[PDB]
């Protein structure tokens, strides 16, 4: 994340840290969200290159990347489901959404705690009004050209950008569509970045925190007229329910 602040997972207990195994401790691969005690939602493009589930481990309750967090829960991935109509067109990912069924080494899934909670899915086709504050979090770099990672969870606030603006020529134009949503800071000072993909965009809907977006893509990071682009979760509830449901 560019801008925003270092934060504890208590502020974002649904954040799932997804690591990829090496041949050599696992490397942080991308973010995710705990939508069910046994199910985590992340971005499909995180996994399209090496889609075998054994390549990945999932940690819940992590404020610190690649070190031990008290309260941490470690999970193997028993099901790794990528959206079957996923595609990459231009710089955009379409149907960028993935499901991760998680289980501990003893066969359990997430146990609710201060640092580990589920996030509510939105109602069908329902988003917050455009211009609404939504939070984004993750282990991503603090600028696109930074060599280092902050190694520590970051959280920030962006505003929903209407499809009508976002599809304007000096914004994305037609390389976005209606099953994506844009989010940006009014003066372009904060945004999701390198390492944030798969992570949650949380809006307030019907008086509850709601997974509204999944960090997908965007041109450059916190750049004028170039909002962050997120998988619009409210259009994937049937697909989600066809699996976990």
């Amino acid at each position, epitope marked *: 994340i560019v801008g925003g602040e270092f934060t504890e997972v208590e502020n974002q207990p649904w954040f799932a840290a997804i690591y990829q195994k090496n041949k050599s401790p696992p*490397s*942080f*691969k*991308c973010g995710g969200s705990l939508i069910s005690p046994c199910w985590v939602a992340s971005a499909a*493009h*995180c996994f399209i290159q090496l889609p075998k589930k054994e390549n990945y481990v999932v940690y819940l309750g992590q404020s610190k990347e690649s070190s031990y967090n008290p309260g941490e829960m470690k999970f193997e991935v028993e099901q790794l489901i990528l959206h079957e109509y996923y595609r990459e067109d231009s*710089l955009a990912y379409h149907n960028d959404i993935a499901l991760l069924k998680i289980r501990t080494s003893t066969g359990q899934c997430a146990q609710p705690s201060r640092s580990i909670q589920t996030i509510a899915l939105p109602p069908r086709f329902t988003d917050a009004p455009f211009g609404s504050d939504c939070e984004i979090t993750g282990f*991503g*770099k603090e*600028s*696109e*050209s*930074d*060599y280092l990672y902050p190694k520590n969870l970051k959280m920030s606030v962006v505003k929903l950008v209407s499809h009508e603006q976002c599809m304007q020529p000096h914004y994305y134009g037609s390389e976005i569509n209606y099953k994506m949503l844009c989010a940006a800071d009014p003066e372009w000072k904060t945004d*999701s*970045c*390198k*390492g*944030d*993909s798969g992570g949650p965009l949380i809006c307030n809907i019907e008086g509850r925190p709601t997974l509204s977006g999944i*960090v*997908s*893509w*965007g*041109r*450059g*990071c916190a*750049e004028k007229n170039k909002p*962050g682009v997120y998988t619009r979760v409210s259009h994937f509830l049937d697909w989600i329910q066809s699996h976990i449901g």
Partner: nanobody
Amino acid sequence: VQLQESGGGLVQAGGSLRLSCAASSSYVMGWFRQAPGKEREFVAAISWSGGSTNYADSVKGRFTISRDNAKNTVYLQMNSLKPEDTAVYYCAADLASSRDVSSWYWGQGTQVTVSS
């Protein structure tokens, strides 16, 4: 893929040198180096628009990284060089998307030697 460096060589301390790298864009471009007895370290990086730039602390204020998106070229301007800067310099490309963890690709490198 194939990033090719050029411009290296022997310079006396306090002198200047300009490294060029040709790529064969949308990615972050950068420069790394490998000093004697050490593994490869980060030197500089720059996003596609020049909007974000970044340097290692040891080269701050006397190295300047630039970019030409027309010719797919990236440059490293090295001023006020010291014996500490003797290394094999590798231009690099971050071939990951703007929301993905960085995945660096390196050239074959070019020798830079600074006298004293």
